Amino acid sequence: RPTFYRQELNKTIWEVPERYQNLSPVGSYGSVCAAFDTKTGLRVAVKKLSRPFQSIIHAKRTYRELRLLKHMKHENVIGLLDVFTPARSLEEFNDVYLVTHLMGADLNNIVQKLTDDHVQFLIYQILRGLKYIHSADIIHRDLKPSNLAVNEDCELKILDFGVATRWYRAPEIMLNWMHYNQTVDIWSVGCIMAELLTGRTLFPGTDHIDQLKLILRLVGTPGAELLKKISSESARNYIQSLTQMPKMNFANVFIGANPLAVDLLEKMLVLDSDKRITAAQALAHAYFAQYHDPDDEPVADPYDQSFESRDLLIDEWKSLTYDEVISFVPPPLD
Ligand SMILES: Nc1ccc2c(NC3CC3)nc(-c3ccccc3)nc2c1
Ligand SMILES: Nc1ccc2c(NC3CC3)nc(-c3ccccc3)nc2c1
């Protein structure tokens, strides 16, 4: 066990290993401090979870967050440098702190007027991380510029938790489809890419009804092939009742963009999610010609999501979390 030290940071009592020095609050789910990690000489983010075990729901979320972070080992996905608690046993375990690399800024923070070459590289790395995430049978579901961290070097990582979420949300989620799949995240990337190319939010809906309206304006109203797959009578009838909007020609919307970027946008922003390009397929698209390497786009180890279907007591989730803190193995130095 390391020596721990205590301090007050903007209302909170932080108790951290001596390893982490010069804590400096950066934002407040829980709050975050920048720190110097004396073990590596790198700046790190230390996140103290707020009330991690205060309900069955908080408790399972805490476990979920730790399981996910522990799993991610990819250059374009946030990973866990450390997890620790000041507690010496399960019985006094009440606090969890998570340590990750400190990233420069978020993609929202860097959006003024982006060059096509920057767009290629940034979207490439998003798709590379998503390939990896999706290969674990995980759906991010909340991809938006504030959940993407970027270095000054333009290196990007997808974050679990860092502008309205809805603006980036696939139409099938707004419509409450229970069986939406991983291409919801490709929809989101499409929305992000469009925004990077034009400097404007592609769909700034004021709410979900407005959001779908703006969406169908561009992608047009569902064809016969999509309608016959919609299990909800009310939703199909609603969809079918709207004024028929033809799909816009994207060349006439993203005027002057690289035609390859326009073409990839066409394959991402397909209304029918069964026809949307996957992350793995997007990577091989011609737009990423100067970056794509089929031998350096790895997939993830399988991830056991079976706890998701379990209903456990608070102390059991809390105990499973403690087990995960105890079994944590630091990533290799350098
Ligand atoms: N195989 C599929 C493909 C796309 C689907 C989709 N897409 C949303 C219209 C854009 N929506 C729905 C659905 C089902 C119940 C209630 C509301 C929506 N199902 C879909 C099934
Ligand atoms: N007359 C109707 C009948 C059904 C509807 C429905 N059905 C989905 C199963 C919930 N969803 C929506 C809607 C519209 C915009 C954004 C999100 C959802 N509108 C409906 C309007």
Residue numbers in the entry: 5 to 32, 35 to 117, 120 to 170, 183 to 354
Paper text:
Interestingly, several MAP kinases, cyclin dependant kinases (CDKs) and glycogen synthase kinase 3 (GSK-3) contain a hydrophobic pocket at their C terminus about 30 Å away from the ATP-pocket. Recently, Diskin et al. confirmed the existence of the MAPK insert in p38α using protein X-ray crystallography and proposed that this structural feature may “fine-tune” kinase activity. Structural biology studies of p38α in complex with β-octyl-glucopyranoside revealed flexibility of this region and its ability to accommodate small molecules. Although, as yet no clear biological function can be attributed to this hydrophobic pocket in p38α, potent ligands which specifically bind to this allosteric site may offer a valuable starting point for the development of chemical biology tool compounds for the investigation of its biological function.
